[PDB]
Structure formats: C-alpha cells, structure tokens
C-alpha cells in the first residue's frame, strides 16, 4: 500500500496503544528510572532542539516500553520501530515536540500520573495532526 494518511494514522494509533499502556502500568518504574533523568538532562541542556531531538526522542518513547520488562511488548515495538522512525521523519517538529517531551517528563517525575498519560496522548495526537496537515506541503 501507499505511504498515506491511513498509514500515518495507523502508526500513531499503534504507538498510543502500546506506549500509553506501558506508561500507565509501569508509571512508578518509569518515574524512578535513571534513564528518565538522563533524558531530561539532555533536553534541559540546550535552549534550537534539532540535535537534542532524535536521541532524546527515541530514548524517551522506548523507555516507556522497556519499563514494562515484557519482552514480547518490547519485541513488537522494535518490530514496528523502522515504521515509527519513518513517520517521525515525515515532518520536522523538533522545537515543539521537544517542549511536549519536557512537559511530559515533568508530569512524570512530579507524580502526576493522570496528567502524564494525558500529555503522552496529546503529544502523539499533536504529532499525528501536524504530520497529516503537512502531507502535501513537500
């Protein structure tokens, strides 16, 4: 099939399914992880947010999945990662996605589980909307 609106929407919906489940169910492990603080540091360390982005982005989303310790979930996420990576490269949103990550991280470390789950959904839906908005602006 084509690289089209449906392909994009399916990718982001799958991410919401997986990443939000893991954030919700492994919230305390994520919040307590050294990896989270390292990612936060990498974001905080710069004003922009092109260099910051690709690393920090993959690391943050993959952390939520890894924290499950469920090797089947981890493997399924790795299986679809090239597709996830394609879709993220369709539209450059470094500054704004970075801001959303930073806010997500602060909700997590401050213990606002309900708000972190909301922010992760909002973030993925925002990314989706902007990617679809720009599908014909190449």
Binding interface with its own copies (CB under 8 A): 1, 10-11, 13-14, 17-18, 21, 68, 70-73, 76, 79-80, 83
Q: For residues 29 and 134, is the Cβ–Cβ distance under 8 A?
A: no
Q: Please, what is the minimum distance in Å from the beta carbon of residue 32 to its own copies?
A: 20
Nearer to Zn ion, 10 or 55 (CB): 55
Nearer to its own copies, 10 or 38 (CB): 10
**Is position 61 annotated in a ligand binding site?**
yes
Q: For residues 63 and 20, is the Cβ–Cβ distance under 8 A?
A: no
C-alpha to C-alpha distances, 58 to 5, 62, 103, nearest whole angstrom: 22, 6, 16
**Cβ neighbours of residue 108 under 8 Å, at least 6 residues apart?**
23, 27, 30, 31, 36, 116
Q: For residues 87 and 131, is the Cβ–Cβ distance under 8 A?
A: yes
**Is position 4 annotated in a ligand binding site?**
no
**Is position 55 annotated in a ligand binding site?**
no
Nearer to its own copies, 13 or 92 (CB): 13
Q: Is 51 helix (H, G, I), strand (E, B) or coil?
A: coil
**Is position 101 annotated in a ligand binding site?**
yes
Among Zn ion, its own copies, none, residue 51 binds (CB under 5-8 Å by kind): none
Q: What residues are designated binding site for Zn(2+)?
A: 54, 57, 61, 89, 101, 123
Q: Which residues bind Zn ion (CB under 5 A)?
A: 54, 57
């Amino acid at each position: 099939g084509a690289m089209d609106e449906k392909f994009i929407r399916e990718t982001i919906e799958t991410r919401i399914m997986m990443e939000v489940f893991c954030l919700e169910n492994y919230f305390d492990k994520i919040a307590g992880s050294e990896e989270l603080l390292e990612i936060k540091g990498e974001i905080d360390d710069v004003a922009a947010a092109r260099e910051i982005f690709d690393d920090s982005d993959e690391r943050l989303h993959k952390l939520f999945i890894r924290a499950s310790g469920n090797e089947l979930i981890i493997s399924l996420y790795e299986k679809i990662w090239d597709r996830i990576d394609l879709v993220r490269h369709l539209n450059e949103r470094y500054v704004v996605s970075n801001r959303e990550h930073k806010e997500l991280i602060e909700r997590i470390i401050s213990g606002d589980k309900e708000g972190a789950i909301e922010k992760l959904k909002e973030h993925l839906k925002n990314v989706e909307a902007e990617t679809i908005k720009n599908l014909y602006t190449y």
